[PDB]
Amino acid sequence: PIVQNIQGQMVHQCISPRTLNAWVKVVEEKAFSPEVIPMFSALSCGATPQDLNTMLNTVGGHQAAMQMLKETINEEAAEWDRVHPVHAGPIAPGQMREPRGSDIAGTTSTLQEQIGWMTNNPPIPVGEIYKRWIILGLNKIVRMYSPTSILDIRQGPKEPFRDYVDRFYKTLRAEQASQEVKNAATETLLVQNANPDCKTILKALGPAATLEEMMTACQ
Amino acid sequence: PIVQNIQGQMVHQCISPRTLNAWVKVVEEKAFSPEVIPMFSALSCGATPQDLNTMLNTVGGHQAAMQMLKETINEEAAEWDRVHPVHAGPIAPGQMREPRGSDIAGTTSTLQEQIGWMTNNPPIPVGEIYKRWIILGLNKIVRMYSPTSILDIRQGPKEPFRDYVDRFYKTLRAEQASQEVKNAATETLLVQNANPDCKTILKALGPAATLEEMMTACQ
Amino acid sequence: PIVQNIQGQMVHQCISPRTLNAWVKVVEEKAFSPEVIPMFSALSCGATPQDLNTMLNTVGGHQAAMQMLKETINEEAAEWDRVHPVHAGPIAPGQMREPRGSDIAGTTSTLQEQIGWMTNNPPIPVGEIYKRWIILGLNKIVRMYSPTSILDIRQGPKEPFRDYVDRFYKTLRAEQASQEVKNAATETLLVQNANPDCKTILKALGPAATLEEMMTACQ
Amino acid sequence: PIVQNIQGQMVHQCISPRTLNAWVKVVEEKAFSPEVIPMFSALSCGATPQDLNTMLNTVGGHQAAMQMLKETINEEAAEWDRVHPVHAGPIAPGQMREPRGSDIAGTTSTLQEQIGWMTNNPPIPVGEIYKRWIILGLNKIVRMYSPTSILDIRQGPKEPFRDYVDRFYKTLRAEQASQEVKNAATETLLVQNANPDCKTILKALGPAATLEEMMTACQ
Amino acid sequence: PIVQNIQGQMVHQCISPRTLNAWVKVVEEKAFSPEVIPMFSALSCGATPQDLNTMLNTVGGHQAAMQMLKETINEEAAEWDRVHPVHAGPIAPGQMREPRGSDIAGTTSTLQEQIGWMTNNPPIPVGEIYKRWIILGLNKIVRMYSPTSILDIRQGPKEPFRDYVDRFYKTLRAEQASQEVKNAATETLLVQNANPDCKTILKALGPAATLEEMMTACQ
Amino acid sequence: PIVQNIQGQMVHQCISPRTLNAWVKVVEEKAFSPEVIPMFSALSCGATPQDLNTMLNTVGGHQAAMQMLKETINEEAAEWDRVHPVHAGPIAPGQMREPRGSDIAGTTSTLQEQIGWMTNNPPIPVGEIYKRWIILGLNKIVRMYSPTSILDIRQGPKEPFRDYVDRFYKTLRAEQASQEVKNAATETLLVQNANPDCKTILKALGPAATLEEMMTACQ
Amino acid sequence: PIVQNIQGQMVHQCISPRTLNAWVKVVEEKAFSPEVIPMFSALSCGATPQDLNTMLNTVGGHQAAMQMLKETINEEAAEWDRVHPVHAGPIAPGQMREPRGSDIAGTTSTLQEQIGWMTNNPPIPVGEIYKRWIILGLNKIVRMYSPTSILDIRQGPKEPFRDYVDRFYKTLRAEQASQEVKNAATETLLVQNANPDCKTILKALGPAATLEEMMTACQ
Amino acid sequence: PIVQNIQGQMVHQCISPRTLNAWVKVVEEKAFSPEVIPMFSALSCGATPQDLNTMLNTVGGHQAAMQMLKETINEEAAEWDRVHPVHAGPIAPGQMREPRGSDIAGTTSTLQEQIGWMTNNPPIPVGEIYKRWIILGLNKIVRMYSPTSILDIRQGPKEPFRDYVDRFYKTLRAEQASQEVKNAATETLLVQNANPDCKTILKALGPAATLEEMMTACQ
Amino acid sequence: PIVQNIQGQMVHQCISPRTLNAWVKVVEEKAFSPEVIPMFSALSCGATPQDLNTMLNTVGGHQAAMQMLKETINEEAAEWDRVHPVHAGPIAPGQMREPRGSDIAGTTSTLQEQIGWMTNNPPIPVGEIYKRWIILGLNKIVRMYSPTSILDIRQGPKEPFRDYVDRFYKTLRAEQASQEVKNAATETLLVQNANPDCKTILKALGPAATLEEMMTACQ
């Protein structure tokens, strides 16, 4: 990845064995839990598309999942070649060149072109545009690894209310719902899917109470 | 490997014990899975041919595999001595010298010659030419470690469709097929080798559907 | 070991606890496998003879093996005192001094003399001359730890041909044969010591075929 | 310990948690094997007497052994106060002061005095004088942890000759004999304490043969 | 001007008062002698077009000469806008922009654009393209300040031959003739325009003799 | 002035005695010639308004001229307080503050505020806004020091044409006319104010000829 | 010229106005005295051939002398193209190229080629080879500026002997005689060309006395 | 000269035009006054023998004086070849070499050898040994430029006593007498060569009074 | 002098030609005016005693004055050898040594000892102790160069009162009186030695008025 030294010149360093071993052991332990994506965004900090393709290629299993990631990048590369068309023929374009969809993806671009693109006065964040293509592709992977939906999450009879909300928001995080979708679930679905006793306890609280004073009610 | 310091002078550092222990423990755990090559390309970042020969020589087992790697490099060294012939006798060639096939391979070249070759204004990437000789040799190693072919990958009766595509593209990655070869398999071989029920479900989708909306069909 | 900083001045650093723990744990796991030597040459990168003697002295077991290493260095130190004789009496030799066989070995030389010898404009690689004395001594150690010779390596009846070549070149690497010795074994000993069936399959290939197309024949 | 930076100014760094954990785990695994001393000399590289006293004080067990180390340092501190007497009264000695036996040992000296003493143009190696007091004290510790003497090391009837020389020089290293003492043992004690068969094989070799051609004789 | 620091980053420094006072005092002493141009090329080393326009604007007199320099730059700026046309409309050209003829001349370009243009991986030498426009304009200025032509340079009767060749090549340097034009003058015009006596002395030398053995002839 | 170091941090240096002596000796030699302004813009490169007020205050004579410069800055400071009004009361504005007209002029601002204003991520060029106030004030000073107008510049009878164009554009530079004003003078006033003989020579050239081929005509 | 920074990287700096003004004012004061060459060798320290050609081109007068310098360089450039012939056609010579006689002279070589040539591991001192061509050419210039020969240097009747030896060795330095030529003059020409009185005083000293005890004799 | 940078590595810089112009203008103003030597020792601070020979070669006049300096160095070079003889033949002396008398003098040594000699751990101060040869040679030059001896320095009748002691010690400094020689002159020659009146005033002071209370006596 | 670099290590630089030429030209213009001492203290900032002796030795004239400076230093060196006696014999004093009176004066101390003495943790300011010996010696020199005493300073009849106080305090500064001595002169000698008219004007002011309201009274 590109790093900032003491001076501020964006020099290029190679990916460490610590970062390589960290990303591989996340996927081996947890397959495609929703917290893997937050981890990916942190291990690949300022990474070149050569370094971003290295982290995807070192994953051993989940080859059905990595084909969805490969088809999503090919959809975004074709979208980038449509929204950003070529101006004219490169008769006098210099050594630099406007990146296509296959140059941001690291397929038709060398390492020296990717280091230059990110260091331009007006930096072309090809390491950041390609990261949003993987993350949008990783959100589709973790959506099919969700074992259940939010409509099937109901509280057990001997299950405490802290374990039910733990299962409720773990399923809601797996379906990758938005803030507006999650706001409707915490006011119209969390109370109604509880046990009858706790549910009543929660209908007496009022129309909308925060979860800090809710869970304590059913302690 | 050569590293870039704060100034930008390509100084030479030695290979760390972290990088030495990382490459050895990859080969011990997974023998010659196709993800070992992506790992190799990452641990040997800007490595001199002395450092590239060190990583090949620290592998304990798989001496049948390392002899294929040794014969592939000797084929590429003889090819480099044919496509890049000697101009004339080195009467006044200076301290520098045009590298042969045995100097890129690190056999007849010292460490001081390899550091110089890579630091020349027009750098002679002898650490990168030799890396493509190992990677081309490593692709032949992982092709013979594939336990089965793509024609023998069929879906089981109780096997879910996510596990069948996991086995299908793990075998396809082991045979190291190209993008054109893999494009024919995902449109004429993935559907036809499934279970009858799922296969029908997939023939009703149309001529060519993406895998994101395919696997979900047979959920 | 001497390291190169950002400026290029060969400053002296101490051996890290990572490098100390790496070299000790190699010898504990594998005793004197032929890949230990390649590892030694990598952990002791630019090491002073004080640092090279530290790595030999931290090995707990194999005291029969370390006495062979001690007698080999004493043979090379006496050889260095014969091929490099003293010119005259050091009446005005300055603070520097031409190293003897016992100064390269780190016995009669201080640390400040060894740092100076390696930093001279014409560097006296006393850390590299002494490393070739250990490596020549380590090759004699791993030759007596070979459990069998190459004439006793024969293919089993149910043994696959990939496992036979794995055992053949592991024994050949343990005896430390040269390239000319190994070239005669791969054309006159590898085929003849196989199983009858495979051997025939290999006599029909021709006089000399490469191992990439050979092993596949007996797949 | 004092380290050398890029410029060459001997700045003071603190002992790392890696170096602290390395020295403690050596003593926990192997109690006082003779290879612990070589390890100590490597982990405490350029260490101040504050840092040298820290490594001795973090050892949990072997309090009988650490009292021998404490009494040996007190013997060397009293010896240093005799061989290096005070010149006169320090009426105008400046901020610096000639170190006593209790200032090299780190008992009556602060950290700022020990950093100064080592950085003087004529450096007073108080971190190196105190290290020879511990190492001389550690040699007395490992001499009493030797389980047997060299006169009780005899070859077993079914014991191979490689295992007998392994036991012979491990006991000889535990008694910390000199080179002249070890030269008499390898010519008058190694052969005579072997099995009768091997011993004869070794008397036919001649008066004095090297161990490389000896052990092979009794292979 | 842009300068190279210790690291190699092309930082921008301001023009020194030493460089400002040097260029002004050249023009005050010698008006437009042909050696002023060589001086200009040396004082403006790596100068931005803001810094190149500063050196032209600090010249007090010779406003007839500076209008020829202004009209020559306007001719080269219109030529640059013809040989380097605009590719298309700058809908998505980024912060950078292809320089026109009025941006290299420093008229329609800010200082931050000129520093960027010269620091691009493929540097656009706008400080060097504009310098060739001034130097081509300065050659037209010094051609009209020549007080005489080469056909009017004849040797005086009491004038020594060293002073005649001094006047001959000072006039030839003022007319800014090429190497092919000067080669015809030194073989067909230098001898024939001398005094009769010296001329004869030079016709006896042969067809073409070098000036080192010629001037000595007429000493 | 603020300077850029090797790292790129805009540190503050003091004005050198070389720069102080350079600016004073320009005004002493030439009073308010139009080339003084170009010099001022070069000596005050990246200067703080404290440093810009220092250069104006070290001028000994021309106190009638410096009062015009003081009244012009007070006009621009009142204009800046009108075009850039205060948003609201600074209840929570932090340590930084939006500069008024008297803070850019260096009257009500300290040195620490001016260094901060220029170093902000979005730098407030208070050293550059104040420089345009002096330069606009200096253009009014040099307009009243012009000894004659352009209508009184006529060619003398024995005056050569190179000296007439020297006097014509020195007067035109003193009146500070624009490019459109100077374009009308070089096509309708330069020819008509010459000597009759030269004028005719110039009417035969055509409607509009460049000065390079014009002055030569009247050589 | 190339300078060595703190790190040791041979960065390129421009020639200072101090060095430009120093070399010009030497030639203006003393025309071609023999001490100008020693000065030239000192002002042009590590100078590129672009910088060496700049110092020759800023000399105003002595155009007869600068044509001898131009013809001497053309003789050495043709000699360099004969003693260093081209090996073969540059089909694959890289970005670097073996310098011809016109590339060392700075005629057909750019600045970027000259900086590279001097920075090569085996540096091609093109700034030092070209300096010996100027210095050999400058020795021919100062030989023709000698006003008299050594045979015409005789002591005057009222001239003291210190002034005669001052005139004797100033003429001998102007003719650029070698050490063997000057050794014959100080033993067979210095005594015989003196005044009769002093000469006798010097014949009584003996065959060969040093000048320290000679001049004192004739005090 | 060799300079010490921020790190402490003795890099080589070239002699500045300021130092070159300073040493030349000392000799032009004052010919060989005794204060020129102190100046020389200060301008040539850490100078290489190439740089020391440059300062001697840029002196225009005094060629009788520079021949005494040349003969003194040749006497010291022959003395150095006698007191420091060659040990043996340089069969294996490395790149470094023990300097002769002609290598310290800068005649048979290159610049790269002189930089190395001074940077050796045990630095061979060839720039300091050669400086003592010039200074010993410069003391012989200034001894013959003394216009009078100390026996001819007598006080005039109207001359004040401050001007007589000014002339007395200027002549004593020109003859380069030692401290023991000058101690005898200030007690037996200063008083006796004064005017009768002052002399008496000084005989009444006593046997030996300091000059601070002496000159005041004759105020 | 010792300078502080960016890091803070007190490296040793040589005295510049600017500092050498500054100190010499002060003494040539003004002989021993009282402002020369303040200048000396500023040019010799952190100077070693080698550098302090260089500045005293480059003074051409005033050899009567420099002998007073030499005798004052010899008085202070003998005083330093009495107030700071030797403790005992230097049997084990190390490389460092307590400085005597002749080592601070730079007579019996090398440059390497003086750099060390000033860099000690407890720095021995030998460059500052020796500076107070010169300054105490320079105060005795400027006391004898005073042309008149304070009792002979009387106001002339047509002399204005500003010129009388200018002459009064220039003589008082030449006699180097203390603050208590100068306080008695400004209250009992300044008024009484004026002209009668002004004196009366000053007796009407009162007992003691400041000089700001005094000189104005006699305007």
UniProtKB/Swiss-Prot annotation, chains A, B, C, D, E, F, G, H, I:
Identify the residue position(s) of the site Cis/trans isomerization of proline peptide bond.
89-90
Region forming the signal peptide: none
Region called Interaction with human PPIA/CYPA and NUP153, residue ranges: 57-95
Where is the region Dimerization/Multimerization of capsid protein p24?
145-219
Q: Which compartments does it reside in?
A: Virion
After translation, the protein is modified as follows: Phosphorylated possibly by host MAPK1; this phosphorylation is necessary for Pin1-mediated virion uncoating.
Role played: Forms the conical core that encapsulates the genomic RNA-nucleocapsid complex in the virion. Most core are conical, with only 7% tubular. The core is constituted by capsid protein hexamer subunits. The core is disassembled soon after virion entry. Host restriction factors such as TRIM5-alpha or TRIMCyp bind retroviral capsids and cause premature capsid disassembly, leading to blocks in reverse transcription. Capsid restriction by TRIM5 is one of the factors which restricts HIV-1 to the human species. Host PIN1 apparently facilitates the virion uncoating.
| Subunit-level organization | Homodimer; the homodimer further multimerizes as homohexamers or homopentamers. Interacts with human PPIA/CYPA; This interaction stabilizes the capsid. Interacts with human NUP153. Interacts with host PDZD8; this interaction stabilizes the capsid. Interacts with monkey TRIM5; this interaction destabilizes the capsid.
Q: What is this protein called?
A: Capsid protein p24
Task: Point out the gene that encodes the protein.
Answer: gag-pol
